[PDB]
RNA sequence: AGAUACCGUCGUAGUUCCGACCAUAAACGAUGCCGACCGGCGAUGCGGCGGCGUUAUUCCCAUGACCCGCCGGGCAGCUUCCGGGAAACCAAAGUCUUUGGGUUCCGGGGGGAGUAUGGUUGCAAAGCUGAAACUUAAAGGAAUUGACGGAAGGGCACCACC
């Protein structure tokens, strides 16, 4: 992951981050996230250092591939922005998706019908998905979280610094990390690019779904 | 039990402010303590602006405004329903209502 | 009669694949099945109802009297629990506080006063515990001292398998819930105290959720 | 004002340990601070510290482990005979198995266990366990 | 009984005691 | 935890946070032993051997749990020294 | 006050969820469906359930309902959610880039790309909302 | 304590001495007022002559007439 | 009902100034002072330092007005499982049975009582100092649930109204 040519950040991956805008962080800054920022712009935007983004992506991928049972890595998004991306990440990795409305006590209350008991949480936003983090406090659940410059690292146990706000940047980070866990499992080779398209994971405005349905004819 | 952290007033580094006389009563209220409104108001409400516009000598005359600053004691203010009792969590909201 | 485990950890315990709750407490795993402690320490577990306490809420018409039962549980050789259950009748309160105690059992680390020969007999270091106002201090004592204590913590420390101990309570100990909780908080903190015995850098053994990660996929849904 | 310099230093590394910091800056360097720290180091409670000479009272950076439960001062520096040293280690240390009471003797600043060996009492500085 | 008016009654009572003790001096 | 004879006498040796070196109680339910997968450096695939880092609840609610794992992986040769 | 109680709705949801394909839009046919596939002791309750069943069937014809699941779930969230365009919105010819984003790419290995248009910086450093 | 000086023994002692008069049990047993006022004059028992027999009303809630003696 | 009240019209002392007294207030942050350490964030006041750019002196300099940050001291604020506390709550009311940085004042159940008495200060009013006999099982603090309100808001009924 570090000082290795095989798992080093490639040239096409930088163009996928610059188009998506994963480097382009929020206006505000958390003190726990000063180490994952190159520099601040003029017009108060923080630029995330994509090398450190890439190392935290690999470390997360390691954490997920280490989990021998692929089923019990529960992958969570509340916000619409992630609900598609996390559901396609389940298809790829063989994870368990919870897309929208995380019922409190799904890790803590046994008698609930949707009582999941994972080994690892993956979280699209520590703020929006605060309730999964907090129930990870009550059952020994390490937590990977896609974090912004604004996001608090309360109960997040490895943070992937990103734009987790923008539609493209989320789906791309989920694509990147789905492709990385399947690479590191030895399912896919590394020389050729991946069959699954990074555009697949992007949430679309319900305006855009009926705009494509109009433009399909 | 200490109900309000600021003590219901707005002095932090004084130890004395000057008393204002409550407009409704004549009660002497610390300036910072007093509940203050700034009422801008048209000299005529709604029914009389219809009549003045027609009986004005002038060409589309903009009507003048009546600029009062009301100072209330806490008792007058609550009785006249300017301020109002709130829940212990909702007390802490310093945002003025829309 | 036949126990049916609903949690992941309970399923391992029933199938004799995690073989002592020492292994559960190594990974700080929340025990929520009652029959895990009934499985391992089942014969060496004894129950004493510390207090039946009637509590009341004032209603439109009279009081609604419910009964709060404090149950101290533990084998006289390593483990204690302390369960508190409030119910409308006394039998439901006692039974519920037996279950909550079993769930809540912790292991007590016990050490030596001076000479280190034979089995350990006392608390390994001075450890305070508290809730409310009640501050309880447990102090290592020599062999044969007994538990020099008020009758409530004396009853938990007997149940902890501690033979010898000096106590020193503070605040409103007359409130038993606080006093029983405070002395349980004091023996809770024995395996949460970093002595020089516990300096040898940690060898991380494999989790029971990893050791039997291939077994759990088929054994249940 | 600042009066007991050793007190400030010991509370400073105590507050740093409690938070879980890996190293701490203790602003005034005395001789008594260095001796106390060396005694804590020789029993493995802290890592290799280092003093920072500005042409004033120096500063010390101490590399903390997670071994130090508490590090305290006793003020004033009470004068302890060998007879009394048992009654200080009974009411100032958790166990008789571990923990130390550093006291300045004529021999030097050392733990109660070395004070017993050398048969030399002295003034109590503080303790650590 | 307000503690201020208690303090006022105890002052008047004292003030009558100082008035009645003076008439032997 | 020997006696005078040498017998290991306490009933379990508790884990200890890899970040702070502070032991992890039987009921610190916010603890996390995180397994980081290893790599055959020529291939870039999962070996089967993995590094195990434990963290106590206290650091996790303190918000320092990610930077602790970042240092532990960098201090294991997983993360680049550059970073 | 014609509000359906929990006994009507729960029954009507489970009847659609398990026997979707037997139902339609007509009240009177799925009245007789509810007769067969459920043992309802009342005639009035039978009608209530049949009635709300038909209402939920009209709602399902429009779009997916929050408190029920369809077998594929349902040719749009399953099949159409596998939508792929000709070329990705990522695959851009000219990617606009900040001068300071150019700097962190220069302190990366990627100091010189072909398809990055480094832009003029945002003059007039004014990016906050005024107070009060 | 509040003054932890090595040479504060007369401040620590004289303070305790002064504040010990706010203890009610101490002041009673260490003034001559409670003893000079005590009918028994600081004795366990005392003999006296019965002069009348009195019926004292019980404080209240429990209302009986307690047969005491004026001595 | 009375109304040596609240309401109203008058209205002396006083209210204002100078000179002397007086020395008390819910004189409050009901929180003594000095020192160290222990999260974060946005503000604001003062002084200094650096930085794209707008703007005035237009003729530029350098100063003002803004904007963006940094530092120190200040009144504060928000947030947080630092930690503390009976709790309300508190970045201090934390670093406390794992108890010791320095130091002053002061409390010891409720009453009696800030009374009596002596001293002292004052023109006086009164201030400071200040008990006891006797009496009593509680007085009190915080919080919870109810009940109640001549507090605020919402809902319902031809045993309410329209």
């Amino acid at each position: 992951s570090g000082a290795l040519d095989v798992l080093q950040m490639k040239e096409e991956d930088v163009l996928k981050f610059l188009a998506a805008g994963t480097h382009l962080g929020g206006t505000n800054l958390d003190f726990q996230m000063e180490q994952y920022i190159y520099k601040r712009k003029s017009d108060g935007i923080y630029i995330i250092n994509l090398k450190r983004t890439w190392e935290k992506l690999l470390l997360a991928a390691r954490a997920i591939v280490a989990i021998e049972n692929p089923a019990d890595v529960s992958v969570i998004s509340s916000r619409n922005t992630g609900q598609r991306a996390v559901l396609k990440f389940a298809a790829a990795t063989g994870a368990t998706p919870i897309a929208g409305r995380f019922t409190p006590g799904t890790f803590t209350n046994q008698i609930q019908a949707a009582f999941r008991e994972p080994r690892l949480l993956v979280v699209t936003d520590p703020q929006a998905d605060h309730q999964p983090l907090m129930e990870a406090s009550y059952v020994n659940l390490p937590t990977i979280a896609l974090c912004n410059t604004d996001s608090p690292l309360h109960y997040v146990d490895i943070a992937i610094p990103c734009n987790n706000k923008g539609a493209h940047s989320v789906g791309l980070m989920w694509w990147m990390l789905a492709q990385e866990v399947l690479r590191m499992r030895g399912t896919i080779s590394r020389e050729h690019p991946w069959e699954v398209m990074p555009d697949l994971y992007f949430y679309r405005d319900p305006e855009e779904i009926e705009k494509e349905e109009q433009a399909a004819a | 039990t200490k109900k309000r952290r600021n003590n219901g007033r707005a002095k932090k580094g004084r130890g004395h402010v000057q008393p204002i006389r409550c407009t409704n009563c004549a009660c002497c209220v610390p300036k910072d303590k007093a509940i203050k409104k700034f009422v801008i108001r048209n000299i005529v409400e709604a029914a009389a602006v219809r009549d003045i516009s027609e009986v004005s000598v002038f060409d589309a005359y903009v009507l003048p405004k009546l600029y009062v600053k009301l100072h209330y004691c806490v008792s007058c203010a609550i009785h006249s329903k300017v301020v109002r009792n709130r829940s212990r969590e909702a007390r802490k909201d310093r945002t003025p209502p829309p | 009669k036949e126990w049916l485990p609903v949690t992941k950890l309970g399923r391992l315990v029933k199938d004799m694949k995690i073989k002592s709750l020492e292994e559960i407490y190594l990974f700080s795993l929340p025990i929520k099945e009652s029959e895990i402690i009934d499985f391992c320490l089942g014969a060496a577990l004894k129950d004493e109802v510390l207090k039946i306490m009637p509590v009341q809420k004032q209603t439109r018409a009279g009081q609604r009297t419910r009964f709060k039962a404090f149950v101290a549980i533990g084998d006289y050789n390593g483990h204690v629990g302390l369960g508190l259950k409030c119910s409308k009748e006394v039998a439901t309160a006692i039974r519920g506080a037996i279950i909550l105690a079993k769930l809540s059992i912790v292991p007590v680390r016990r050490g030596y006063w001076g000479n280190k020969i034979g089995k350990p007999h006392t608390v390994p270091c001075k450890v305070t515990g508290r809730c409310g106002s009640v501050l309880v201090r447990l102090i290592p004592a020599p062999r044969g001292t007994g538990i020099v204590s008020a009758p409530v913590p004396k009853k938990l420390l007997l149940m902890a398998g501690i033979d010898d101990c000096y106590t020193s309570a503070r605040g409103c100990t007359a409130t038993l819930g606080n006093f029983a909780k405070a002395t349980f908080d004091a023996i809770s903190k024995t395996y949460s105290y970093l002595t020089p015995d516990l300096w040898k850098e940690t060898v991380f053994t494999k989790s029971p959720y990893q050791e039997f990660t291939n077994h759990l996929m088929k054994t249940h849904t | 004002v600042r009066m007991n310099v050793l007190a400030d230093a010991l509370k400073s590394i105590n507050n740093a340990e409690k938070r879980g910091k890996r190293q701490v800056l203790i602003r005034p360097c005395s001789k008594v601070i260095v001796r106390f720290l060396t005694v804590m180091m020789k029993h493995g409670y802290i890592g290799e510290f280092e003093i920072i000479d500005d042409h004033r009272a120096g500063k010390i950076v101490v590399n903390l482990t997670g071994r130090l439960n508490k590090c305290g001062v006793i003020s004033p520096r009470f004068d302890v005979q060998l007879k009394d040293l048992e009654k200080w280690q009974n009411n100032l240390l958790p166990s008789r198995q571990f923990g130390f009471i550093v006291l300045t003797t004529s021999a030097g600043i050392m733990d109660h266990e070395e004070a017993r060996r050398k048969h030399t009492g002295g003034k109590i500085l503080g303790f650590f366990f | 009984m307000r503690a201020k008016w208690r303090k006022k009654r105890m002052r008047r009572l004292k003030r009558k005691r100082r008035k009645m003790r003076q008439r032997s001096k | 935890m020997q006696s005078n004879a040498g017998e290991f006498v306490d009933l379990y040796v508790p884990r200890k946070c890899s970040a702070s070196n502070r032991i992890i109680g039987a009921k610190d339910h916010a603890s996390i032993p995180m397994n980081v997968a290893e790599v055959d450096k020529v291939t870039g695939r999962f070996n089967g051997q993995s590094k195990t880092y434990a963290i106590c609840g206290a650091i996790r609610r303190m918000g320092e749990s990610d930077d602790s794992i970042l240092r532990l992986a960098k201090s294991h040769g997983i993360v680049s020294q550059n970073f | 006050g014609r509000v359906r109680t929990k006994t009507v709705k729960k029954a009507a949801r489970v009847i659609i969820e398990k026997y979707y394909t037997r139902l339609g839009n007509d009240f009177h046919t799925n009245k007789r469906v509810c007769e067969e596939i459920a043992i309802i002791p009342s005639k009035k309750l039978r009608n209530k359930i049949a009635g709300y069943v038909t209402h939920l069937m009209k709602r399902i014809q429009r779009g997916p309902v929050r408190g029920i699941s369809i077998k594929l779930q349902e040719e749009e969230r399953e099949r159409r959610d596998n939508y792929v365009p000709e070329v990705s919105a990522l695959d851009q010819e000219i990617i606009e880039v900040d001068p300071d984003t150019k700097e962190m790419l220069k302190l990366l290995d990627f100091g010189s790309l072909s398809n990055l248009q480094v832009t003029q910086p945002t003059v007039g450093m004014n990016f906050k909302t005024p107070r009060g | 304590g509040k003054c932890r000086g090595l040479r504060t023994a007369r401040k620590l002692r004289s303070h305790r001495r002064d504040q010990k008069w706010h203890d009610k049990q101490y002041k009673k047993a260490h003034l001559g007022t409670a003893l000079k006022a005590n009918p028994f004059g600081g004795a366990s028992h005392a003999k006296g002559i019965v002069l009348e027999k009195v019926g004292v009303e019980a404080k209240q809630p429990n209302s009986a007439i307690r047969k005491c003696v004026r001595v």
Side-chain angles (χ1 to χ4, degrees):
Chain A
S1 158
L4 262 72
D5 193 49
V6 176
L7 297 173
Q8 193 64 230
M9 191 184 192
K10 219 177 282 179
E11 182 266 358
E12 295 93 3
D13 306 327
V14 176
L15 296 179
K16 285 185 178 67
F17 286 151
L18 288 170
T22 61
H23 70 275
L24 199 63
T27 309
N28 296 127
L29 174 57
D30 198 44
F31 80 110
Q32 298 280 24
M33 294 294 287
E34 277 214 12
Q35 69 172 320
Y36 304 146
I37 277 169
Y38 170 63
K39 195 177 179 293
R40 190 169 173 262
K41 289 190 186 188
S42 186
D43 192 66
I45 293 157
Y46 284 93
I47 300 158
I48 297 168
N49 203 145
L50 290 166
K51 192 171 179 171
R52 289 180 271 194
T53 304
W54 183 254
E55 286 290 356
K56 299 315 300 290
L57 195 150
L58 290 167
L59 209 165
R62 286 173 174 263
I64 298 162
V65 168
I67 306 305
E68 187 167 32
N69 184 2
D72 69 355
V73 176
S74 202
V75 177
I76 297 161
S77 187
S78 65
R79 292 184 68 248
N80 290 329
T81 311
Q83 275 191 42
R84 186 172 176 179
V86 300
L87 195 71
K88 294 297 178 204
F89 187 99
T93 314
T96 305
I98 306 164
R101 188 61 204 156
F102 178 79
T103 298
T106 44
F107 299 146
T108 321
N109 194 351
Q110 288 75 251
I111 304 173
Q112 288 191 10
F115 175 62
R116 268 64 67 87
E117 192 166 15
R119 281 166 56 77
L120 182 60
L121 263 82
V122 201
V123 162
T124 306
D125 187 22
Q127 292 210 349
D129 307 295
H130 65 81
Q131 191 70 49
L133 291 185
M134 293 300 293
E135 262 88 306
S137 187
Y138 298 129
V139 174
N140 314 94
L141 290 167
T143 325
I144 307 165
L146 283 304
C147 295
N148 208 323
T149 66
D150 179 56
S151 287
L153 307 196
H154 211 332
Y155 290 125
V156 320
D157 315 302
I158 205 70
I160 310 169
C162 304
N163 190 36
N164 61 22
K165 187 174 181 177
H168 294 301
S169 53
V170 167
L172 192 271
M173 287 300 317
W174 284 105
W175 179 78
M176 277 281 174
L177 193 131
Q179 163 224 234
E180 190 55 38
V181 294
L182 290 179
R183 282 174 181 251
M184 291 184 82
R185 275 182 192 181
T187 298
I188 320 160
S189 183
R190 298 178 167 280
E191 300 297 327
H192 300 281
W194 188 29
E195 185 176 20
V196 176
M197 204 159 169
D199 208 287
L200 181 65
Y201 281 35
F202 302 167
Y203 176 76
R204 315 183 69 188
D205 202 36
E207 190 274 336
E208 291 188 347
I209 292 168
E210 293 180 17
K211 186 176 177 180
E212 193 276 311
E213 189 173 354
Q214 187 177 3
Chain B
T1 174
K2 194 172 183 183
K3 174 145 107 134
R4 261 69 65 84
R5 189 185 186 188
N6 60 5
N7 304 328
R9 57 191 297 178
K11 70 169 192 62
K12 307 300 295 188
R14 279 98 213 151
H16 183 79
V17 294
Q18 290 67 243
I20 307 175
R21 312 304 299 285
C22 177
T23 56
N24 183 23
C25 323
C27 208
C28 302
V29 198
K31 173 157 189 188
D32 65 340
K33 179 77 165 298
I35 292 88
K36 292 178 288 293
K37 283 173 67 182
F38 188 76
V39 179
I40 70 169
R41 196 181 71 186
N42 289 123
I43 51 89
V44 287
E45 37 163 30
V49 59
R50 183 70 171 80
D51 297 320
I52 286 175
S53 55
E54 298 299 330
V55 309
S56 72
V57 178
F58 298 133
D59 189 65
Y61 180 67
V62 61
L63 282 172
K65 284 190 179 179
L66 184 135
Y67 298 83
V68 188
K69 188 177 169 69
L70 297 170
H71 309 268
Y72 286 106
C73 49
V74 167
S75 41
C76 301
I78 296 164
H79 183 74
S80 65
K81 297 179 178 181
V82 173
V83 300
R84 183 174 291 173
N85 60 293
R86 306 196 285 175
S87 52
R88 290 185 302 109
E89 297 186 350
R91 283 198 211 288
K92 296 186 177 186
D93 293 28
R94 292 189 81 262
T95 60
Chain C
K1 184 174 180 179
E2 190 176 15
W3 175 45
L4 184 60
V6 179
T7 66
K8 188 195 286 190
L9 195 270
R11 188 61 192 171
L12 293 170
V13 167
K14 187 176 173 182
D15 304 347
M16 288 82 160
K17 295 203 166 180
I18 182 159
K19 67 179 181 179
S20 194
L21 46 72
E22 307 317 323
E23 297 172 34
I24 299 169
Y25 294 150
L26 182 52
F27 297 100
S28 310
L29 290 174
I31 299 172
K32 298 188 174 175
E33 297 289 331
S34 181
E35 295 85 340
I36 294 168
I37 292 94
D38 192 55
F39 185 80
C40 286
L41 299 173
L45 253 354
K46 294 176 185 178
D47 320 326
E48 282 188 327
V49 176
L50 296 175
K51 188 182 176 66
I52 302 302
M53 186 177 169
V55 296
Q56 290 177 330
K57 79 177 296 300
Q58 190 73 99
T59 60
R60 180 180 291 106
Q63 292 86 233
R64 181 77 285 279
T65 313
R66 288 185 290 168
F67 298 85
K68 177 182 265 60
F70 307 136
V71 170
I73 201 170
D75 65 335
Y76 297 147
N77 185 7
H79 313 85
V80 268
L82 192 273
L84 337 119
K85 184 66 172 186
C86 173
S87 192
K88 297 185 182 169
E89 59 272 16
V90 63
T92 306
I94 289 163
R95 191 174 297 95
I98 289 161
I99 286 165
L100 284 182
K102 282 180 185 183
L103 263 70
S104 180
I105 70 158
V106 294
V108 309
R109 182 182 169 74
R110 63 160 76 82
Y112 290 92
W113 188 91
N115 190 28
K116 210 183 289 175
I117 187 157
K119 297 185 175 295
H121 58 104
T122 187
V123 181
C125 54
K126 287 172 187 177
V127 279
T128 193
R130 67 179 301 164
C131 79
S133 197
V134 180
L135 176 144
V136 173
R137 184 182 164 80
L138 303 182
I139 293 140
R143 290 186 171 284
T145 306
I147 298 144
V148 181
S149 178
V152 180
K154 191 173 181 179
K155 200 177 269 77
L156 266 79
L157 289 168
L158 242 102
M159 278 180 172
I162 295 164
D163 199 289
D164 309 296
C165 194
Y166 291 124
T167 69
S168 174
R170 183 71 165 91
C172 188
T173 59
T175 62
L176 221 83
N178 294 140
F179 192 16
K181 278 183 187 184
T183 188
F184 182 74
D185 180 37
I187 36 187
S188 289
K189 289 175 71 181
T190 58
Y191 271 116
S192 195
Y193 205 97
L194 192 276
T195 66
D197 288 302
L198 280 307
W199 282 353
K200 188 175 179 182
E201 65 271 33
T202 319
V203 282
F204 301 107
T205 191
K206 193 177 286 186
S207 177
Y209 297 167
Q210 192 168 26
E211 185 66 39
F212 300 97
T213 197
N214 277 21
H215 178 262
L216 288 163
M217 259 315 282
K218 68 177 184 177
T219 197
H220 74 280
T221 308
Chain D
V1 291
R2 171 173 302 94
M3 291 193 183
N4 197 345
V5 174
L6 191 264
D8 286 345
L10 296 200
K11 191 167 282 290
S12 180
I13 74 166
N14 193 45
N15 295 154
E17 271 285 4
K18 281 180 187 178
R19 183 52 72 98
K21 300 298 193 179
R22 294 305 300 275
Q23 62 185 351
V24 56
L25 181 64
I26 53 170
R27 289 175 41 231
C29 177
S30 179
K31 195 180 297 178
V32 174
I33 291 177
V34 177
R35 294 290 175 180
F36 197 110
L37 287 167
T38 53
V39 172
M40 283 200 295
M41 178 191 297
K42 288 298 296 178
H43 295 292
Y45 279 28
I46 64 172
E48 50 181 357
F49 68 90
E50 80 94 356
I51 99 169
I52 295 167
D53 178 61
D54 59 338
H55 284 116
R56 292 171 189 76
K59 306 175 184 185
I60 304 172
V61 172
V62 181
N63 287 107
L64 297 170
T65 69
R67 294 177 178 187
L68 189 64
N69 295 310
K70 188 162 193 172
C71 158
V73 71
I74 295 292
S75 189
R77 304 189 206 288
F78 291 116
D79 13 41
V80 182
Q81 286 96 322
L82 267 298
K83 294 181 267 66
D84 307 340
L85 186 53
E86 185 66 35
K87 287 184 284 189
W88 280 99
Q89 77 188 334
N90 192 228
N91 71 356
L92 202 56
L93 296 177
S95 205
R96 301 182 67 247
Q97 304 298 336
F98 68 97
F100 297 101
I101 288 168
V102 91
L103 32 82
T104 182
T105 63
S106 69
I109 292 170
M110 58 200 193
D111 59 323
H112 67 69
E113 192 161 8
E114 194 175 5
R116 191 64 58 87
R117 289 185 195 101
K118 289 196 173 180
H119 195 82
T120 313
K123 301 191 171 182
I124 192 168
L125 293 178
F127 61 97
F128 52 84
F129 49 79
Chain E
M1 174 61 82
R2 190 208 273 203
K4 187 172 177 188
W5 307 142
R6 190 177 311 114
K7 178 180 178 178
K8 195 167 188 76
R9 280 185 65 184
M10 291 310 300
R11 270 181 185 178
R12 289 174 180 177
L13 207 280
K14 277 177 71 177
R15 186 170 184 178
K16 186 172 287 296
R17 282 165 170 174
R18 284 186 294 98
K19 181 64 183 294
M20 290 297 162
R21 280 179 63 81
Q22 190 267 305
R23 297 183 68 183
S24 294
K25 303 173 184 182
Chain F
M1 302 58 74
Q2 292 95 334
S3 44
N4 252 9
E7 183 65 41
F8 293 146
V9 82
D10 73 314
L11 33 81
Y12 89 99
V13 179
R15 286 179 305 136
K16 195 165 50 172
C17 175
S18 198
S20 63
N21 203 98
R22 289 189 298 171
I23 59 172
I24 293 167
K27 297 196 174 291
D28 184 15
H29 298 309
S31 307
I32 41 136
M34 181 148 43
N35 298 307
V36 178
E38 286 294 342
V39 154
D40 192 2
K41 65 179 188 177
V42 73
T43 317
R45 281 182 182 187
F46 178 52
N47 303 140
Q49 65 190 334
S50 38
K51 292 332 109 91
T52 139
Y53 301 124
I55 298 288
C56 65
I59 298 174
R60 275 197 63 192
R61 66 178 62 90
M62 201 157 63
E64 293 292 337
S65 50
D66 89 307
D67 184 36
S68 70
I69 295 291
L70 194 273
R71 284 184 301 94
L72 282 169
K74 222 144 51 156
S75 101
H76 218 137
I78 302 291
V79 172
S80 179
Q81 273 207 326
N82 198 172
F83 185 65
Chain G
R2 288 177 178 276
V3 183
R4 279 68 149 254
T5 62
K6 61 187 285 295
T7 55
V8 171
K9 293 177 177 287
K10 282 186 182 185
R13 287 185 186 109
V14 173
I15 280 170
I16 295 168
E17 203 153 25
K18 290 187 180 175
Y19 297 96
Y20 180 63
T21 57
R22 289 176 180 252
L23 302 173
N25 222 308
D26 178 56
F27 167 73
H28 300 282
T29 50
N30 48 37
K31 172 175 64 185
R32 285 285 190 281
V33 168
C34 297
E35 270 282 311
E36 294 288 329
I37 59 91
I39 307 166
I40 313 162
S42 158
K43 183 191 285 188
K44 187 183 287 290
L45 185 62
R46 192 274 318 286
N47 303 319
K48 295 285 183 65
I49 290 164
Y52 189 55
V53 154
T54 50
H55 187 74
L56 283 178
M57 286 299 291
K58 287 183 290 172
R59 283 184 66 188
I60 285 163
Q61 290 286 309
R62 286 201 296 273
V65 181
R66 194 185 289 271
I68 206 162
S69 58
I70 320 301
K71 75 286 192 187
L72 297 178
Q73 189 68 86
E74 176 51 36
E75 198 63 23
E76 305 303 320
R77 183 262 189 183
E78 186 59 32
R79 190 268 299 166
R80 194 262 310 282
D81 201 49
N82 293 110
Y83 177 76
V84 165
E86 182 179 12
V87 293
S88 55
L90 298 180
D91 201 344
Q92 294 174 349
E93 286 189 325
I94 309 299
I95 297 168
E96 289 179 8
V97 153
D98 182 86
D100 298 322
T101 56
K102 189 69 174 176
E103 284 291 318
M104 50 89 66
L105 292 179
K106 190 184 71 173
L107 289 177
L108 275 172
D109 192 31
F110 306 102
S112 59
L113 276 303
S114 190
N115 61 332
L116 297 187
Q117 176 66 43
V118 61
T119 194
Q120 63 93 41
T122 62
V123 75
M125 186 157 51
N126 191 163
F127 60 86
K128 295 185 187 169
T129 310
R131 285 71 169 263
Chain H
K2 197 61 182 288
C3 77
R4 295 192 176 78
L6 198 269
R7 309 169 76 186
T8 49
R10 94 173 52 262
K11 189 62 171 67
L12 277 175
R13 181 180 57 177
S14 72
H15 178 252
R16 181 60 52 245
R17 201 167 64 240
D18 286 15
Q19 291 296 339
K20 211 180 286 179
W21 293 100
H22 299 112
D23 200 328
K24 189 185 274 192
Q25 292 107 21
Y26 183 81
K27 190 150 189 185
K28 180 182 71 180
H30 288 82
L31 279 183
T33 59
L35 192 57
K36 183 62 180 179
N38 193 18
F40 277 11
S44 44
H45 302 246
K47 282 175 77 181
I49 296 164
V50 172
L51 59 92
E52 70 185 324
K53 303 191 287 178
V54 179
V56 182
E57 293 287 358
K59 205 106 81 43
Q60 227 256 77
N62 46 226
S63 76
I65 294 172
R66 300 273 167 262
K67 287 95 185 67
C68 307
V69 166
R70 179 63 83 187
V71 182

